[PDB]
Amino acid sequence: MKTVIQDTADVYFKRKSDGKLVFTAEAQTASFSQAISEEKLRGGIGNKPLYILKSEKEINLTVKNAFFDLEWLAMTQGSERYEVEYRTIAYNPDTEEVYSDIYIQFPNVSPSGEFEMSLENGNALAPEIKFEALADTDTDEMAVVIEASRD
């Protein structure tokens, strides 16, 4: 009651082309990073055009609790690029009441981890796992977000 405060999150990871759900739920570190940039890649053009708005852009995500699954892990035991739903709750600061929940949806996912902890002293499981937001050429990609609190 003195000084601390914590909150909660949740991570859902899913596989395209099937109702399978092969992953965890509860991001301990839950680190998410998004950034934009540019360079001199277009350092020279024929002029009289307009733009391309490259911006590079990138989406880096992470989760760490493990316990992926047993049924679907066994089913895969014997390359849709996967998709993500992120659910978070938001409360009104004036009243501190639970009224809004957040949906986060990245249609394309990419599993790419540094496949060697090799830690000199054994850990308590928790294999942190990082995430790169994949994307095709067609349309949208990245995310669409939904919001609760329709009170």
């Binding site: 890649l41 009289k48 599993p111 790419s112 830690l119 050429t137």
Partner: protein
């Protein structure tokens, strides 16, 4: 004891008894000698020694006096003369020079000779294929197998040595082999667990490198073994002579040296905020000398503790501090004394010995961390000839593994990180024309798609073109690459991927960004026989338009993707459209209308969007600068902030302004914005605020050169 020394030659007889048993070991950390002599002398990393607990005769101070004095050496007997030479041969190999009181301008030598460090993967297969002629060669062979990723054949040879190491008076091999054997098993525990959980989907399949029977056996032998008591169980004799390894039994040793880097790290950063200088051995060179010592002792004794994450942490943070120290050394203020004491700046030169370090131990996210806080372009890279040999060591090693059918997947986790990171770090080294032709070929064709999406590959090939131009050989590899990705692009579901959204569109841009007249004979052959009904093939090479022959252009302008809005912006991105017609503008109004109706549905459902293909920011920019004269744009004010920043600047709510957008902006847009009255008097305020608050330099370039 030591106080009872007595005569002159009783010193060498005493020093021999303490330092000789370490001759079975090869290279001894200069600081770790305080243990063998019962803390009697404190060992400085700079190569000097100073009395701490001695109160009797100075058995160390006379020894260095004999080293200098010549007539005294002849006074010893032949054996004692040999014994002195035996001890003299050791210290010069250790770097302990003289006593502190006679400390001169010392230049300690740093020479790491382990073949693994040089990464000559070819030779390690050559040496191993041989019959052993000593127990020593067996163990030196047992570490080469673990470096190559062979975690199973190592165990059997690691088990061979423990049985053969008992019937003789040498505990050196027995204590070191068992450390490794447990360290191969602890690695066996993680990789097997790491493969099972996330390895099924990481590689696209489940790969079981380790046999079931081997996995059962390891879980049987080691289940009742605690490493903390390993040193205690050895004979009393071993506990006496080899006290220079007891920290090594446990992982306190990297803790005791990783904690020590904190105090110096605190001192070095502490020395920075005050603008301090440093006479004598600066606090930062202490890190430089301490860093190699922890390196060679493990690389030259083949201690398997070298390839662990906890080890990577200590060398990741150490070099970040020095490169920072160099970065600060370059920007010092100079008030009234620096020139006399340090003039003609003797910069920290990035030798070859500093390159294997960064290439091996940093991950790809870590090097990007150094970029935003260290202008690593300025630093000189000397010894550039030797950099080539290890680089071609990489670009040749990658070719072997992934061309052949067999991939040593245990090796694939420890090494693909290394090969990944190294070719990133080639954009600060001048590569020869011939050596580059090997780098570019490995990077494009056979480097796997998994760890480098086709979008990310350009970013890698584009960095090697900074420090080196485009020799005509180099284009010959990009030449076959496009003709390789296009022809594979004939299956109807063989889509591409990206982590920049690049695809093959911008590969041609790099070509024409250095070349002008590439006609690419193969590309003409492809299109010359493309009959019809190949939509995916059609759209793919349509945006390669700058690199087609004249007849291919006209023939493909026929039956081309019509003006569809994706094709419209891409057709512009190839120069097909130079001006907007009312037909062109008419198509835009659909998208503005199409986006609006979905927005009304979105608002009822309370759903927002952040799309990769957001052209909304683009449409407003064209409207600011009079490209589209259509006046219906004002009807679309209020959906996206970047839209209504440009369309209606006079009525714009600048409170909403997000100052990140300015980075994507180009100078041509950053100039016109500096002229507009309705967008000058607020953008100036936000720019000043962020530069005062944060070290984003790109804001300062924007604020100074254009807005002032």
């Amino acid at each position: 004891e030591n106080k009872f020394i007595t005569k002159d030659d009783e010193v060498i007889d005493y020093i021999y008894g303490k330092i000789s048993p370490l001759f079975a070991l090869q290279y001894i950390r200069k600081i770790d000698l305080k243990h063998v002599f019962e803390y009697d002398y404190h060992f400085e990393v700079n190569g000097t020694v100073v009395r701490h607990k001695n109160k009797g005769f100075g058995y160390m101070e006379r020894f260095f006096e004999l080293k200098e004095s010549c007539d005294e050496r002849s006074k010893l007997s032949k054996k004692q003369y040999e014994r002195f030479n035996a001890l003299f041969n050791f210290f010069e190999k250790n770097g302990v020079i003289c006593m502190a009181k006679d400390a001169g301008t010392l230049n300690t030598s740093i020479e790491i000779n382990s073949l693994a460090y040089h990464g000559k993967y070819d030779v390690m297969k050559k040496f191993i294929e041989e019959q052993s002629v000593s127990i020593e060669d067996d163990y030196k062979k047992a570490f080469f197998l673990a470096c190559l990723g062979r975690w199973e054949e190592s165990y059997d040879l690691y088990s061979n040595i423990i049985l053969n190491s008992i019937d003789e008076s040498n505990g050196c091999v027995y204590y070191l082999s068992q450390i490794n054997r447990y360290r191969i098993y602890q690695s066996i525990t993680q990789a097997v667990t790491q493969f099972n959980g996330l390895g099924l989907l990481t590689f696209g399949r489940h790969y079981k490198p380790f046999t079931d029977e081997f996995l059962a056996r390891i879980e049987r032998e080691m289940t009742n073994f605690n490493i903390d008591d390993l040193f205690n169980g050895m004979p009393f004799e071993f506990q006496k002579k080899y006290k220079i390894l007891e920290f090594l039994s446990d992982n306190q040793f990297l803790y005791d040296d990783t904690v020590k880097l904190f105090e110096l790290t605190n001192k070095v950063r502490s020395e920075m905020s005050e603008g301090s200088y440093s006479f004598g051995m600066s606090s930062d060179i202490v890190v430089l000398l301490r860093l190699y010592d922890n390196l060679r002792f493990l690389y030259e004794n083949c201690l398997w503790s070298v390839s662990f994450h906890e080890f990577h942490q200590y060398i990741r943070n150490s070099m970040s501090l020095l490169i920072e120290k160099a970065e600060y050394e370059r920007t010092r203020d100079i008030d009234e004394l620096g020139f006399s004491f340090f003039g003609k700046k003797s910069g920290f030169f990035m030798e070859y010995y500093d390159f294997v370090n960064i290439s091996r131990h940093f991950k790809i996210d870590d090097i990007k961390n150094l970029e935003r806080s260290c202008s690593i372009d300025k630093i000189r890279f000397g010894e550039q000839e030797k950099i080539e040999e290890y680089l071609v060591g990489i670009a040749e090693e990658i070719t072997k593994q992934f061309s052949a059918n067999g991939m040593n997947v245990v090796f694939y986790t420890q090494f693909i990180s290394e090969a990944k990171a190294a070719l990133y770090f080639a954009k600060y080294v001048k590569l020869s024309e011939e050596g580059l032709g090997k780098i570019v070929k490995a990077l494009l064709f056979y480097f796997p798609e998994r760890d480098l999406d086709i979008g990310k590959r350009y970013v890698w090939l584009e960095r090697l073109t900074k420090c080196n131009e485009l020799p005509k050989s180099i284009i010959s590899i990009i030449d076959d690459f496009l003709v390789l990705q296009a022809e594979k692009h004939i299956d109807q579901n063989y889509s591409e991927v990206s982590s920049n959204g690049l695809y093959s569109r911008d590969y041609g841009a790099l070509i024409k960004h250095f070349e002008k007249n590439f006609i690419s004979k193969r590309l003409s052959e492809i299109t010359l026989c493309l009959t019809q009904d190949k939509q995916k093939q059609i759209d793919f090479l349509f945006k390669l338009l700058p690199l087609l022959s004249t007849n291919a252009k006209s023939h493909l302008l026929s039956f081309k993707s019509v003006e569809n809005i994706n094709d419209l912006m891409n057709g512009i991105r190839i120069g097909l459209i130079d001006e907007f017609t009312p037909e062109h503008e008419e198509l835009i109004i659909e998208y503005l209308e199409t986006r609006k109706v979905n927005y009304i549905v979105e608002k009822e459902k309370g759903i927002q969007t952040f799309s990769s293909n957001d052209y909304m920011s683009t449409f407003g920019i064209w409207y600011f600068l009079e490209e589209i004269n259509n006046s219906k744009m004002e009807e679309f004010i209020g959906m996206d902030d970047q839209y209504d920043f440009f369309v209606d600047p006079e009525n714009f709510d600048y409170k909403k302004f997000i100052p990140s957008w300015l980075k994507n902006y180009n100078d041509k847009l950053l100039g016109k914005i500096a002229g507009n009255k309705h967008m000058k008097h607020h953008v100036i305020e936000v720019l000043k605020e962020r530069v005062k608050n944060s070290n984003d330099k790109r804001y300062l370039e924007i604020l100074m050169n254009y807005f002032i």
